[PDB]
Amino acid sequence: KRKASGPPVSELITKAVAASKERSGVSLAALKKALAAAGYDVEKNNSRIKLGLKSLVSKGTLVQTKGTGASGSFKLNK
DNA sequence: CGTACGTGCGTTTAAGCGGTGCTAGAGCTGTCTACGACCAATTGAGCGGCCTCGGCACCGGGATTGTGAAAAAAAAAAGCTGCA
Ligand SMILES: [Ca+2]
Ligand SMILES: [Ca+2]
């Protein structure tokens, strides 16, 4: 009955947190802190989270509404 | 990407061919009467009509089923640890 709680951590989650936010939103900075809130402070995972972007359009998971140079305002169904 | 098929060879097999010999049975002919058309009178089954009353179509409201997204929780690739 204590503090730590958070995510399931991959493309099951990049699709779940982007959908677990009630509405649309920007960048690596929104998605990672929702994914690292439990206590696992970000170390080497920084390249691993970063990679997910081409992996999502190539495998067809999130369309990006906004964003250019490692920024991406990712969408699901409206 | 792996191998199931096609091609082409030499070897083996029995189909095909002609002939003979045998006789089952196909198919023809004649006779004869059981059987089915045809008939008229008889009459009852099944037709149209007509009435009724319970099954079922439709409704509303509740219980149940099944799908799908998220959130959590087991379970394996991706990183490294000193040992030996
Ligand atoms: Ca005859
Ligand atoms: Ca009737």
UniProtKB/Swiss-Prot annotation:
Main localization category: nucleus
Modification(s) after translation: H1 histones are progressively phosphorylated during the cell cycle, becoming maximally phosphorylated during late G2 phase and M phase, and being dephosphorylated sharply thereafter.
Modified residues (N6-(beta-hydroxybutyryl)lysine): K3, K15, K21, K33, K44, K54, K59, K75
Gene Ontology MF annotations: chromatin DNA binding; double-stranded DNA binding; nucleosomal DNA binding; RNA binding; structural constituent of chromatin
Disulfide bonds: none
A GO biological process held by the record: negative regulation of DNA recombination
Keyword entries, A-Z: Acetylation, Chromosome, Citrullination, DNA-binding, Hydroxylation, Nucleus, Phosphoprotein
GO CC annotations, alphabetized: chromatin; euchromatin; nucleosome; nucleus
Record flagged with keyword Phosphoprotein: yes
Positions where Phosphoserine occurs in the chain: S73
Subcellular compartments: Nucleus; Chromosome
Sequence ranges assigned to domain H15 in this UniProt record: 5-78
Modified residues (Citrulline): R23
Domain of life: Eukaryota
Its biological purpose: Histone H1 protein binds to linker DNA between nucleosomes forming the macromolecular structure known as the chromatin fiber. Histones H1 are necessary for the condensation of nucleosome chains into higher-order structured fibers. Also acts as a regulator of individual gene transcription through chromatin remodeling, nucleosome spacing and DNA methylation.
Free-text comment about domains: The C-terminal domain is required for high-affinity binding to chromatin.
Family: Belongs to the histone H1/H5 family.
Annotated protein name in UniProt: Histone H1.3
Record gene name: H1-3
Whole sequence portion shown: 33 to 110 of 221
